[PDB]
Amino acid sequence: NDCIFEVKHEGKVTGYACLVGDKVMKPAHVKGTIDNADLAKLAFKRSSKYDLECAQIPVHMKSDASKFTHEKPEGYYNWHHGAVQYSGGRFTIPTGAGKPGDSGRPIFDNKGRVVAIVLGGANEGARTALSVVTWNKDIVTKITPEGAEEW
Amino acid sequence: NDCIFEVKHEGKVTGYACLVGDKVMKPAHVKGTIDNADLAKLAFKRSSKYDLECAQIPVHMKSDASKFTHEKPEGYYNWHHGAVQYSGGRFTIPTGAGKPGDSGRPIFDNKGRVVAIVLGGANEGARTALSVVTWNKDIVTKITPEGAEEW
Amino acid sequence: ASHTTLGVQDISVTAMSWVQKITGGVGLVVAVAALILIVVLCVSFSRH
Amino acid sequence: SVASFVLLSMVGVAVGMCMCARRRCITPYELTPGATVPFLLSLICCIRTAKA
Ligand SMILES: CCCCCCCC/C=C/CCCCCCCC(=O)OC[C@H](COP(=O)(O)OCC[N+](C)(C)C)OC(=O)CCCCCCC/C=C/CCCCCCCC
């Protein structure tokens, strides 16, 4: 934990950029400059398909990036605003747990490794379906439940 | 039992709808107007072959969606008139347990998921076979015994 | 007229190949549609 | 007039049979929760998934 950085704006934080493996994850819909000076200077390749902005970590100096994994067994995970529960192909939370302005928050498994980065959520009544950027064995994927709004 | 997601659909109660997975499911032979006065306004696709009818669950009640699964190991399952046993490729209940008006009752595994939806059945003395729809991997099926009738 | 009448039936001229072409195209479309219908019917009837 | 009328009616019957085939080959996938329609069958029968 504590490896993430808030992407700062003029007067408030609009999202969170996470360090995973050797890439500086950052959602693309959120805009800002990133707090840390060096990270702001990297070339961020974008993709509207996956709503992501990533760049090679200066791994010569950043040797603290979070571990990652590709398997997502159904169970319970945590995202620093509570505990996210897995079911089928959705992530659900208590309705008030999620809030705008905290998009890009990494979510971990029980062993302290990230599995997905939240982009937004759809309030389903009691639960909130999370739109996340995860990855399978090979390549990233964007699970977007119906009616999910950006954060 | 421990989770309510069913709704009736007629002033004279005959048949019920369920919130299974991402579909609101109601058997075809029953007729009426699904309550809460919004679900009945949904666009419903029907198939007289399977005696089934479905519609997309509105995002409002995605939290109320019941979990479901496709495996049906030999054993005992419970519904709202007691318990059933999936013995020898058939769902059977003790005679007199079911009666007209009982279609649309789901059938649960011990973990609370849905594995079946009852349409009716026939009796052989002390026991009674069931006519039920079920879904294997990716495809629904319907199983019916000899001399059954709609409930 | 020295000859007889044109013909009591279907003595339209060559370049009725236009008729043959349009009828053949419509028949091909109908045959393809019928084949698709019967193959999906066989698939749905196998399913039980 | 007769030839034009029947031919357009023939293509109408063909398109109707195509629509009926699409309906009867797609409804099993519509009823089943999970929505695992393959990419190939979605393209052939001209349907789209709920996550695209
Ligand atoms: C769903 C809809 C269903 C509705 C059903 C529709 C029914 C409508 C019809 C009723 C029929 C009307 C007939 C009117 C009475 C006429 C009687 C007649 O007096 O009959 C004249 C002769 C027929 O002689 P017969 O055999 O009866 O005598 C033998 C007599 N028996 C058989 C007893 C021995 O007729 C001739 O000979 C004249 C020959 C002239 C040939 C004209 C050629 C026209 C060709 C056009 C082709 C177009 C070009 C194609 C370009 C396309 C490019 C895309």
**Which value, in Å, is the radius of gyration of the alpha carbons in chain A?**
15
Q: How far apart are CA A38 and CA A34, in angstroms?
A: 9
DSSP string, C1-48: --S--S-SS--PPS-THHHHHHHHHHHHHHHHHHHHHHHHHHHHHH--
Please tell me the distance from the alpha carbon of residue A103 to that of residue B104, in angstroms, as a whole number: 41
What number of CA atoms fall less than 13 Å from residue B75's CA on the CB side?
11
Nearest CA in chain B to A127: B63
Intra-chain end-to-end CA distance of chain B, in Å: 21
Q: DSSP character for A80? A: S
Distance CA B54, CA B17 (A): 9
Spatial separation of the C-alpha atoms in residues D9 and D12, rounded to whole Å:
5
Q: How far apart are the CA of D3 and the centre of ligand 1, in A?
A: 12
Q: Closest by alpha carbon to A104, among A125, A120, A122, A123?
A: A120
Cβ-contact B127, B84 below 8 angstroms: no
Q: State the amino acid at position A27 in one-letter form.
A: P
With 0-12 / 13-18 / 19 or more C-beta atoms within 10 angstroms meaning exposed / middle / buried, residue B27 is buried
DSSP assignment of B12-69 equals S---EEEEETTEEEEESSS----GGGTGGGS--EEETTTTEEE-BPPGGGSTTPBPB-
Torsion of CA A123, A125, A129, A131, to 10 degrees: -10
Other CB atoms within 10 Å distance of the CB of residue B6: 14
How far is residue B142 from each of residues B49, B57, B118, B127, D34, measured CA to CA in Å? 9, 22, 10, 20, 18
Residues whose CB is less than 8 angstroms from the CB of residue A80 and which lie 6 or more positions away in sequence, other chains included? A1, A105
User: Do A55 and A45 contact (CB within 8 A), yes or no?
Assistant: yes
- Of residues C23, C33, C47, nearest to D17 (C-beta): C33
Residue B39 C-beta-side C-alpha neighbours within 13 Å: 28
Burial of A44 (0-12, 13-18, 19+ CB in 10 A): middle
Q: Does D13 touch chain C (CB under 8 A)?
A: yes
The tokens describing D37, both together, are 């329609």
Kindly state whether D51 is in contact with chain B, defined as any CB-CB distance less than 8 angstroms. Answer: no
Experimental method: cryo-EM
- Asked if B20 and B61 touch (Cβ cutoff 8 Å), the reply is no
Residue B85 near residue B132, CB atoms below 8 Å: no
All residues of chain B having their beta carbon less than 8 Å from the beta carbon of residue C43 are none
Report the C-alpha gap between A148 and A142 in whole angstroms: 12
Residues B9/B16, Cβ–Cβ less than 8 Å: yes
Residue A51 annotated to the active site = yes
* Inter-residue contact B67 to A127 (CB < 8 Å): no
Among A148, A129, A137, smallest CA distance to A88 is for A129
**Residue given tokens 């007039």 in the structure block:** D1
Beta bridge partners of A133: A117, A142
Distance (Å) from the C-alpha of residue D39 to the closest C-alpha of chain C?
18
Amino acid letter at A143? I
DSSP one-letter code for D16: H
SS3 content of chain D, % helix, strand, coil (to 5): 70, 0, 30
Question: Which has the closest alpha carbon to B134: B80, B93, B77, B82?
Answer: B77
Give the distance (Å) from ligand 1 centre to CA of residue C9. 7
Between CA C6 and CA B135 the distance in angstroms is 68
Contact check, Cβ <8 Å, A129/B62: yes
Give the long-range contacts of residues B53-58, CB within 8 A, separation 24 or more.
Answer: B53/B25, B53/B26, B53/B27, B53/B28, B54/B23, B54/B24, B54/B25, B54/D30, B54/D31, B55/B23, B55/B24, B56/B22, B56/B23, B56/B24, B56/D50, B57/B19, B57/B22, B57/B23, B57/B24
The token pair that represents B39 in the structure block:
């679900």
Cα gap B71→B109, rounded to integer Å: 9
Q: Which two tokens stand for residue A97?
A: 């747990």
Quote the tokens at residue A87.
Answer: 């079911």
Q: What is the CA radius of gyration of chain D?
A: 16
* CA gap B51, A88 in Å, rounded: 26
CB A3 within 8 A of CB A21: no
Q: Which residues contact A118 (CB under 8 A, 6 or more apart)?
A: A79, A91, A98, A103, A104, A105, A107, A130, A131, A132, A151
CA distance linking residue B118 with residue B25, whole number of Å: 11
What is d(CA D19, CA C5) in angstroms, rounded to the nearest whole number?
A: 48
Q: Is the CB of D31 under 6 A from ligand 1?
A: no
Q: Shortest CA distance to A80 belongs to which of A95, A61, A89, A93? A: A93
C23 lines ligand 1 (CB under 6 A): no
**Among all chains, which residue has been given the structure tokens 């999370």?**
A130
CA B97 to chain centroid: 15
Q: Is D17 helix (H, G, I), strand (E, B) or coil?
A: helix
* A126/A96 Cα distance (integer angstroms): 9
Tell me the C-alpha distance between B73 and B109, whole Å: 9
> Residue written as tokens 């236009």?
C18
Give Cα separations from B26 to B6, B105, C24, D31, D49 (angstroms).
Answer: 10, 9, 46, 11, 22
Kindly report the number of other CB atoms within 10 A of residue B64's CB atom. 15
Q: Any CB–CB contact under 8 A between D51 and chain A?
A: yes
Give Dmax (Cα) for chain D: 51
CA–CA separation, B95 and B67 (whole Å): 29
Structure tokens at A147: 């009616």
Residues A65, A22 contacting (CB under 8 angstroms)? yes
- Contacts of residues D6-14 at CB distance under 8 Å and 24 or more positions apart, as own/partner, are D7/C22, D7/C23, D7/C26, D10/C26, D10/C29, D10/C30, D11/C26, D11/C29, D11/C30, D13/C30, D13/C33, D14/C29, D14/C30, D14/C32, D14/C33, D14/C34
